[PDB]
Amino acid sequence: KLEAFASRAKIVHIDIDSAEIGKNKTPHVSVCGDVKLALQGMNKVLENRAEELKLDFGVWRNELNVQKQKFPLSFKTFGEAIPPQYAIKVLDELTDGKAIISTGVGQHQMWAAQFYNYKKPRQWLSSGGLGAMGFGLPAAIGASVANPDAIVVDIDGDGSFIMNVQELATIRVENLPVKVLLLNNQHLGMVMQWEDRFYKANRAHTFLGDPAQEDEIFPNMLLFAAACGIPAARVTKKADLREAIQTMLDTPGPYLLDVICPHQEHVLPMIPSGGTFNDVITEGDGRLEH
Amino acid sequence: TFISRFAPDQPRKGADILVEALERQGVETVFAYPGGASMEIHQALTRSSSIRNVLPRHEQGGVFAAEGYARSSGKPGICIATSGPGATNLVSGLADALLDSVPLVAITGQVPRRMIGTDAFQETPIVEVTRSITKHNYLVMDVEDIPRIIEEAFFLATSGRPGPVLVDVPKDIQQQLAIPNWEQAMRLPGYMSRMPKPPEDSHLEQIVRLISESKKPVLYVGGGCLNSSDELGRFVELTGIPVASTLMGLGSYPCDDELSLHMLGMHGTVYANYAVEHSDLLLAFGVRFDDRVTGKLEAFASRAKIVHIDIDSAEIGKNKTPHVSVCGDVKLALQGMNKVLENRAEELKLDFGVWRNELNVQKQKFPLSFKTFGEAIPPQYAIKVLDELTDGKAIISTGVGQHQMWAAQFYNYKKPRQWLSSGGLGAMGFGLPAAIGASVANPDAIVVDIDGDGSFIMNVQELATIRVENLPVKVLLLNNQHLGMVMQWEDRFYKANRAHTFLGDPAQEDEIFPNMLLFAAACGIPAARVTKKADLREAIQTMLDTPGPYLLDVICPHQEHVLPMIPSGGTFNDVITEGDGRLEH
Amino acid sequence: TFISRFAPDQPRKGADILVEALERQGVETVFAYPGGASMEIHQALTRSSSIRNVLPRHEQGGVFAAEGYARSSGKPGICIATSGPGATNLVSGLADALLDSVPLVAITGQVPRRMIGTDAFQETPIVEVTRSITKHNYLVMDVEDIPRIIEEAFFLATSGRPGPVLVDVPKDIQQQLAIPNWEQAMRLPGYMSRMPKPPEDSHLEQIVRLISESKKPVLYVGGGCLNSSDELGRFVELTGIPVASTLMGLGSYPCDDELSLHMLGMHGTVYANYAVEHSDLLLAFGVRFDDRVTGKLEAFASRAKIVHIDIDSAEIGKNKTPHVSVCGDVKLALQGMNKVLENRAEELKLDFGVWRNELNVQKQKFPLSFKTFGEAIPPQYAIKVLDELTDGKAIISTGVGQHQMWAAQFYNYKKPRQWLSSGGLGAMGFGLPAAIGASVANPDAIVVDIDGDGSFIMNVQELATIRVENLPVKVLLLNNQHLGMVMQWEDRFYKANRAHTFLGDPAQEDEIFPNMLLFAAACGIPAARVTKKADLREAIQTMLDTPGPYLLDVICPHQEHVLPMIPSGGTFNDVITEGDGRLEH
Numbered sequence A: 001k002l003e004a005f006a007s008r009a010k011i012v013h014i015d016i017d018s019a020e021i022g023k024n025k026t027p028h029v030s031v032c033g034d035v036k037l038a039l040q041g042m043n044k045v046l047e048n049r050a051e052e053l054k055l056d057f058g059v060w061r062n063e064l065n066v067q068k069q070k071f072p073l074s075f076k077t078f079g080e081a082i083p084p085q086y087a088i089k090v091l092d093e094l095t096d097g098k099a100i101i102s103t104g105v106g107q108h109q110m111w112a113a114q115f116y117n118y119k120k121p122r123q124w125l126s127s128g129g130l131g132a133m134g135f136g137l138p139a140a141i142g143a144s145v146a147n148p149d150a151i152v153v154d155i156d157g158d159g160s161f162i163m164n165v166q167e168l169a170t171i172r173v174e175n176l177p178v179k180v181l182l183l184n185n186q187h188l189g190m191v192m193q194w195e196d197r198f199y200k201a202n203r204a205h206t207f208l209g210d211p212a213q214e215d216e217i218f219p220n221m222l223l224f225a226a227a228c229g230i231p232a233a234r235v236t237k238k239a240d241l242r243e244a245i246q247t248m249l250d251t252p253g254p255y256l257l258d259v260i261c262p263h264q265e266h267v268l269p270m271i272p273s274g275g276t277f278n279d280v281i282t283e284g285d286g287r288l289e290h
Numbered sequence B, C: 001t002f003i004s005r006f007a008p009d010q011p012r013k014g015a016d017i018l019v020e021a022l023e024r025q026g027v028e029t030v031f032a033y034p035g036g037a038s039m040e041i042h043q044a045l046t047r048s049s050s051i052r053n054v055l056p057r058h059e060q061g062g063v064f065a066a067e068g069y070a071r072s073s074g075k076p077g078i079c080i081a082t083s084g085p086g087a088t089n090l091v092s093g094l095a096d097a098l099l100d101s102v103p104l105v106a107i108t109g110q111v112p113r114r115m116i117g118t119d120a121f122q123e124t125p126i127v128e129v130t131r132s133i134t135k136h137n138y139l140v141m142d143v144e145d146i147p148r149i150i151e152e153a154f155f156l157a158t159s160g161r162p163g164p165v166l167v168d169v170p171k172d173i174q175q176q177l178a179i180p181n182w183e184q185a186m187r188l189p190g191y192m193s194r195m196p197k198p199p200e201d202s203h204l205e206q207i208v209r210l211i212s213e214s215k216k217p218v219l220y221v222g223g224g225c226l227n228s229s230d231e232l233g234r235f236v237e238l239t240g241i242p243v244a245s246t247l248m249g250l251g252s253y254p255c256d257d258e259l260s261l262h263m264l265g266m267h268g269t270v271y272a273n274y275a276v277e278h279s280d281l282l283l284a285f286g287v288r289f290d291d292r293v294t295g296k297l298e299a300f301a302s303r304a305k306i307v308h309i310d311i312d313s314a315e316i317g318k319n320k321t322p323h324v325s326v327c328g329d330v331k332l333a334l335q336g337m338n339k340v341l342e343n344r345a346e347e348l349k350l351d352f353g354v355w356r357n358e359l360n361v362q363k364q365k366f367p368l369s370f371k372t373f374g375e376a377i378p379p380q381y382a383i384k385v386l387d388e389l390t391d392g393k394a395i396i397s398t399g400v401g402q403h404q405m406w407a408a409q410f411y412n413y414k415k416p417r418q419w420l421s422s423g424g425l426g427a428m429g430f431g432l433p434a435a436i437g438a439s440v441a442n443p444d445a446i447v448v449d450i451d452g453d454g455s456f457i458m459n460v461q462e463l464a465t466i467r468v469e470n471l472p473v474k475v476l477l478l479n480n481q482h483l484g485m486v487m488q489w490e491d492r493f494y495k496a497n498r499a500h501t502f503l504g505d506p507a508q509e510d511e512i513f514p515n516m517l518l519f520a521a522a523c524g525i526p527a528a529r530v531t532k533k534a535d536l537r538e539a540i541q542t543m544l545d546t547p548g549p550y551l552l553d554v555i556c557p558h559q560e561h562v563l564p565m566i567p568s569g570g571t572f573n574d575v576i577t578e579g580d581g582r583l584e585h
C-alpha cells in the first residue's frame, strides 16, 4: 500500500527515466540522470566536507541490528528431508558465492534470492517484472556463452524447468558447463502457497506429478537429461546433499541435480498483496498441526 | 432533488435521456448546430425548459463559444454537432481546449450503429480522429450507457487537469426508447486511483524553508492558478515575492499590483524575464514550462532552485527537473503554506527588499513602451484607453497575433477569467465566438473581443449569432491590414520579404479592405471606424455606451512590432528591445 | 527537361526543395495560408515564378478551394497550412476529399522534429489525427526524403481510387540545407502490386453476353466515370441502355439526352428509381452502392443481375453481391466492350425499345415538378433559368441542403466536372471556396456557386479572396432563411416542430437576415436581391453579364420541399411524391 510505504520519510529518487519520477510516489527531491554519475558527485562532496558533516547513524543501525537478530531469515528442517533453503545455502558455500545464478519463477526463485549471497551484480539473472517461467535454463545458456570461465547454475523449479526443457539439447550440443540445481517440489509451488494462505489449501491444478502413481517423482527429470547426454543425479536425504552438489560442480560440463524437497514449504516472510508492514506474515507453512 | 419531465417508470427516447443527463449536470447552456444525425437531440432540447441553445453559424464558432463560456466561468462548456462535417468542424476547438486545459464536453451525432465503418452518409470516425486531441472520448454503443457516460464525461472534463471530452452518439441510440438509471456508478477505476492527494505538511514545510533561505525568489504563475486568486494573493502578502505570470495565468495576481512583474516569456517584459534569469528560487505554480516562456531550457532559471506544483504528474520533470515537486491542487498547497507562513512569521523574518529594489530598477529602466506617430493610432494606446474606460473590469477575448500580445501587455487584469485567449494552440478566429460564450455566461458584464483583421474575418459569420441572441458583445478590432505577427517575423528574419501576409486589396492598396463595418451592418450591428488618435477616446466610449453589440474598426499603422522579443530558442541575452517595420531616414 | 532555379550541386533549404518538388509535378496553383511553422515554405513560394498562391481567409476555404480546383480539372488540388490550428482547419476538407474520392495533396508545417510530442506551441499530431480520413499521410523526418515523399504523395493521390494525401513537414527540415536527388525510386511496393490490371477479354465478353440476354437493362453510373465521358456515350449508342446517374456521376452522360433517366436515389426521379427496381440487368459503373441510393439493400435491384466495375477491389461486394465483377478502370472496360459491341453488332441484335417505352411512360406520368405561388420565386425555376441563360455550359458548385438537390435536379449538365458538390461527407460551406478553385482552374469559364443561406455564411470570408484575386465567381444564393433540408425533415417526421433551423432574426421576423448584399459590399463585390419571379430572368442575366464577381440574393418561400423522396432505409414503394411545408385550407 503506497500510502503506508515510507510514510514518514523524505524521499529522494534518482532515475534515468523522467517518466518514472513521481509515477507512483511523489519524491521530495528528484534527480533525472545516471545514478552512477550522481553517486560520483555525492562521493566527492561527502569526502571533502567529511569532517564538516559529522555523519553517524550508529543509533539507527543498532535499532535495525536489533530487528536483524530478532527476526532473521529462517527455515525448518524436517527429519532427513532437504530444505530448499539449505540446498541453496550449500551451493553458496561450495561456490564461494562466485557463481552466476539464473532462476525460474516461483518459490525456488525467492529462496535463490534469499539464501545466496551475491557479491556482484550480474551474478543474479532472474525475471522480475514479467516473472516468466522457463526463463532459467535458457538464461543460463546465454550467461555461460558470455562467461565461459564462470560457474553458471540454473536454480529451477520443476514447473519452470520443464517449460523449456528442450534447451538441454542446446546445452549438450554447444558443450556449455551449465549446472542445473532443480528444486523439485512436484508442484507449482508459489501458486500452491497462495492456495494454502488464501483458499484454504484447495488445490486447483497445482500438482505437477502423476495422480495415479502419486508418490513417484514425476516426471523423471534425470531421463530428460539422459535424453540429451547430460550427466544427472537425484538427491533426497539432506545428509547426501553436500556431496551431491559438489559432484555437480566438480563434474566437467553440463549437470543436472534433481533435489527433492517437501512441498509444504512456504516462502517467508510475506506481506500480502496491497498490505502494509503490520500485515507481515512471519510463521507457518502448508502442514497441519498435531 | 432533481425534477424530471418523465415518470421514473416511463420509457423515453435516448435523445431525451441525453438531454436530461445534461440537466442533471447543471447544464443551462449548449451551443448546438443541427444536422440529420443529431435532429433527435435537437428535438429533445426544445422539450427542455432549463437548457438554452445558442445556435452558431459554424460549428467551429460553436466549440469556441463553449470555450469562452468555460474559460469565463469555470463551468464546463458544451457544444453539440451533427455527424461527419459537423464533427470535423469541432476539431480545432477540441485541440485548443486540450492544450489550454479547458473543461469542455463535446457531443456529436453519429450514423446508426450498424452503418458504422461502411463509409455511410456524413460518417467520420470522429472518435478515432479526436483520440489524440481530447482528454478522453466515447462512442456510445447502447442507450443504457448514456447516463453513465455523460456523468463520466463531465467528471473527466472538470476534474484533475481539465480538458475536452467528446461523446459520439449514433442516431438509432437517440431514437431508442429506454428507462434510464441515474444511480449507475462510474467506471474510471484507473483514473480515480491516480487522482492527486492533498499535499502533505512535509512537502509544504520544505518549500517554506527554501523561501526563508532564498535571497532572490520569483513566483512563476500560470493557468493552473485560475481558481487560486485569493490564496495566491494571501501568499504574496506573507512572502513579498514578486510575481511573473504566463499568458495563461494573467489575472491570477492583479497586473497593476506593486509586486507584479507582469508577463514573462518570448514577449514578456524585460524585468520579468530578468527576475527569472537571476533568481535563486523559482516557485512554478500552475505552469508547464513552455518553450515560449523558457526559450533555451538550459539557460532558463539556470541558477535557481526550482519548485514545481502541478496537478498533472506527467508535467513534473517533463522539460525541466525541479529540486522540489508537489503533485496536487496548487490551491491547497497555497493554503497549507499560508498557514505555516503566518504562524512562523516572526520566526522566519522574510524580507526580499534588496531583490525587489533590484527588479524595481529594471522595471524603471526597461518598461513596456510604444511610439506615437503623428495622428496615427498606436494599437497599444487603444488597449490602454479601453482599460481606463472599463476600469479594468471588462472580460477580454482575443484572436491570435500582435493584437493578442498587446491585449496581454496593455490591459491590467484584476481577476482571472477576465482574460480569454488561445495560448497553446494559438488558434485564430477564437476571439469573436469566445466573446459570445463569455457574454452568455456573464450577461451583466462588459465583454470585449480585441481582434485582428485576419482573426476576425475567419469566424465573421458569428456576428449573426450575436445579433440574433442579442448579446452585448463589443468588438475592438485592431486593423493593420496584415497578418501582423507573421509580418513581424518577416521583418526580423526574412528581410521584410512579404509572403502572403497582406490582407487588403492590392488593386486599391490604400483602401481598408475588407470593409468590416459592412460586415457588421449585414448583421444589424452598429459600427464605426476611427483613424486619428484624437478621436479614439470618444470612439471607444461610444462603443461602450451604446447598448448591445458594437464594432469599432481601429485603424493602426502596420509597421508596429510587439516588443520586447526573445527569438525562438533564445536566451535573455538575445532579447530584442527596439525597432519596428519602418526604414530609417 | 525541367529547369531548376538552382545548380544541381548547390545546397538549398528544404523549403525550396519542397516547392521545386511541386514544380516538377506540374503544379501551378496552391492554396496556402501562412503561419510561423510554414513561413519558410511561403518564402520559397515567392521565389517560384511558376506557382501562384491563392491566399484564402480560412484554411477550410483553402482546402475546399483545392477540391474545387481538383474536381473541375482532374488535376490534383494543393493546399498548404501551418502547424496546429492551421492543420486542424483542413480536417473537413480532407475527410470530404476521401469520401468523394478527390485527388488532393495537403501540406502542413510542423514544429521542429525534436519538439514533437512535447505539447509545443501550435503542435497537433496531425498525422495521427488524419490517418483515418486520408488515403495516406506522411511525417517527413529528414530533408532527403522530401523529393521521394512528394512524388509518392502525388502518385497515391492521383492513381487508382483518387484521394487526399497529407505531408507533414517540421520547421527545421524546411530550414536545413541539402542537395536533392530527383531520381529516387518510390517505396510503394505493396500499393503497386495491387494496382488493378487492364480488363481481360474474358470478363468483358461475359458482360456483353448478359446484355444480349437481358430485356430490362439499366446503367447505374457514378463518380468513377468522370474520365469516361466519350466511352460511356459510345457505349449507350451501341446498346441503347437507359442511364441512371448518382449525385456524383452527373454529367458523365448528358442530362438532356434522350436516354437519360437523370438521378436515382433518395431524391432521385420516380422513373430512374423505377428502372432500377424493375431491371433484370444492372450495370453499376463507377459507383459504390451508397445507402442514399439503394435504401433498403435487399429491395434494391432485387430482381436484377448485377454487374459491378470498380477500380477499388474493396468496394466490390461490400454492400451488395454482384453476379459479375470487374476490378479495373471503367474507362478501359467500356473501350473493350465497345469494340466487341460494334463487331458483333448485327450478331447481337440489341433492341430494348419495349423497356425504354415502359420507362418513357413513367417519365411522362411522374416527371420532376415544382409549384409556383403568386409572384414568389420557385428555387427550382431560378436554377432552370440559370441553365437557359448559361446554355448549360456553366461550372456549378453548391453547398449542402435543398438548394444542392435542386441544383442537381434542374440543371442539365452536359459534361462531368461541371458539377462540383460535396456528396459523401456533405459538408456545408463547400460551395463558395470550391467555386474559387474552379475559377482558377478554369479562367475562361462561367463559374456559379448555387448556395444556401446557411452554407454560404459558413465560409463567407472567402468573398475577400474572390475580390482580391479578381475571380469572375457568380453566387446564385437561394435564400430561404432556414436550414432548409433539416427543416424539411422536421416537417415530414417531427410534425413541423422547429428545432434551431431558422436562420433569420426572430425580433425582426419578416426581414431577410442577415443582409447578404452587405457581405458582398464589404468585399467590394457587386450584388443584388430579387424577390418577384417576374424580375428573376433579368436579374440572373445581369449577374452573368456583369464582369467579375457577383452576388444574387434570390429570396425563396421556405415551405418548399425537395421531391420526390424515398425516406431513410426505405424502398421504392415508400416514395413520397407530393406535399410541402404548407398547411391546407
Ligand SMILES: Cc1cc2nc3c(=O)[nH]c(=O)nc-3n(C[C@H](O)[C@H](O)[C@H](O)COP(=O)(O)OP(=O)(O)OC[C@H]3O[C@@H](n4cnc5c(N)ncnc54)[C@H](O)[C@@H]3O)c2cc1C
Binding pocket: B099, B100, B101, B160, B161, B162, B221, B222, B223, B224, B225, B245, B246, B247, B248, B249, B263, B264, B265, B266, B267, B268, B285, B286, B287, B288, B289, B290, B292, B293, B309, B310, B311, B312, B315, B328, B329, B330, B331, B400, B401, B404, B422, B423, B424, B425, B426, B427, B485, C121
Ligand atoms: C502568439 C502567441 C505568443 C505567445 N507568447 C507567450 C509569452 O511570451 N509568454 C507566455 O507566458 N506565454 C506565451 N504564449 C502562450 C504559450 O504558448 C502557452 O500557452 C503558455 O506559455 C503556457 O501556459 P502555462 O505555462 O501557464 O500552463 P497552462 O497551459 O495554462 O496549463 C496549466 C498548467 O497548470 C497545471 N494545472 C492546472 N490546474 C491546476 C491546479 N488546480 N493545481 C495545480 N496545477 C494545475 C496544468 O497541469 C498545467 O500544467 C503565446 C501564445 C501565442 C498564441
Ligand SMILES: Cc1cc2nc3c(=O)[nH]c(=O)nc-3n(C[C@H](O)[C@H](O)[C@H](O)COP(=O)(O)OP(=O)(O)OC[C@H]3O[C@@H](n4cnc5c(N)ncnc54)[C@H](O)[C@@H]3O)c2cc1C
Binding pocket: B121, C099, C100, C101, C160, C161, C162, C221, C222, C223, C224, C225, C245, C246, C247, C248, C249, C263, C264, C265, C266, C267, C268, C285, C286, C287, C288, C289, C290, C292, C293, C309, C310, C311, C312, C315, C328, C329, C330, C331, C400, C401, C404, C422, C423, C424, C425, C426, C427, C485
Ligand atoms: C443532401 C444530400 C443528398 C443526397 N442524396 C443523394 C441521391 O438522392 N442520389 C444519389 O445518387 N446521391 C445522393 N447523395 C450523395 C451520396 O451521399 C453519395 O455521394 C453518392 O450517392 C455516391 O456516389 P457514387 O455511388 O457515384 O460513388 P462515388 O462516391 O462518386 O465514388 C466513385 C466510385 O467509383 C470508383 N471509381 C473511381 N474511379 C474509378 C475508375 N476510374 N474506374 C472504375 N471505378 C472507379 C470508386 O472506387 C468509387 O467506388 C446525397 C448527398 C447529399 C449531401
Ligand SMILES: C/C(NCc1cnc(C)nc1N)=C(/S)CCOP(=O)([O-])OP(=O)([O-])O
Binding pocket: A104, A105, A106, A107, A108, A109, A131, A132, A133, A134, A156, A157, A158, A159, A160, A161, A183, A185, A187, A188, A189, A190, A191
Ligand atoms: C504457475 C506459476 N506462475 C504463473 C506463471 C505461468 N506461466 C508462466 C510462463 N509464468 C508464470 N509465472 C508459478 S510461480 C509456479 C511455478 O512453479 P515452479 O516453477 O515449479 O517453482 P516453485 O515450485 O518453486 O514455485
Ligand SMILES: C/C(NCc1cnc(C)nc1N)=C(/S)CCOP(=O)([O-])OP(=O)([O-])O
Binding pocket: B399, B400, B401, B402, B403, B404, B426, B427, B428, B429, B451, B452, B453, B454, B455, B456, B478, B480, B482, B483, B484, B485, B486, C033, C034, C035, C036, C082, C085, C086, C089
Ligand atoms: C497567420 C497567423 N498565424 C498562423 C495561423 C493560421 N491559422 C490559424 C487558425 N491560426 C494561426 N495562428 C497570425 S498570428 C497572423 C494573424 O493576424 P491578425 O489576426 O490580423 O492579428 P495581428 O495582425 O494583430 O497579428
Ligand SMILES: C/C(NCc1cnc(C)nc1N)=C(/S)CCOP(=O)([O-])OP(=O)([O-])O
Binding pocket: B033, B034, B035, B036, B082, B085, B086, B089, C399, C400, C401, C402, C403, C404, C426, C427, C428, C429, C451, C452, C453, C454, C455, C456, C478, C480, C482, C483, C484, C485, C486
Ligand atoms: C444543417 C444542414 N446539415 C447539417 C450540416 C451541418 N454542418 C455542416 C458543415 N454540414 C452539414 N451538412 C443542412 S443540409 C441545412 C443547410 O441549409 P442551407 O445551407 O441554407 O441550404 P438549404 O436551405 O437549401 O437546405
Ligand SMILES: COc1cc(OC)nc(Sc2cccc(Cl)c2C(=O)O)n1
Binding pocket: B035, B036, B037, B083, B111, B112, B115, B120, B121, B122, B123, B171, C266, C292, C485, C486, C489, C568, C569
Ligand atoms: C437533414 O436531412 C437529412 C438528409 C439525409 O440524407 C440526405 N439524411 C439525414 S439523417 C442521416 C444522416 C447520416 C446518416 C444517416 Cl443513415 C442518416 C439517416 O438517418 O438517414 N438527414
Ligand SMILES: COc1cc(OC)nc(Sc2cccc(Cl)c2C(=O)O)n1
Binding pocket: B266, B292, B485, B486, B489, B568, B569, C035, C036, C037, C083, C111, C112, C115, C120, C121, C122, C123, C171
Ligand atoms: C509567426 O509568429 C510566430 C510566433 C511564434 O511564437 C509565438 N512562433 C512562430 S514559429 C513556431 C511555431 C510553432 C512552433 C515553433 Cl518551435 C515555432 C518556432 O520556430 O519558434 N511564429
Ligand SMILES: [Mg+2]
Binding pocket: A106, A157, A158, A159, A183, A184, A185, A186, A187, A188, A189
Ligand atoms: Mg515447483
Ligand SMILES: [Mg+2]
Binding pocket: B401, B452, B453, B454, B478, B479, B480, B481, B482, B483, B484
Ligand atoms: Mg492583422
Ligand SMILES: [Mg+2]
Binding pocket: C401, C452, C453, C454, C478, C479, C480, C481, C482, C483, C484
Ligand atoms: Mg437555407
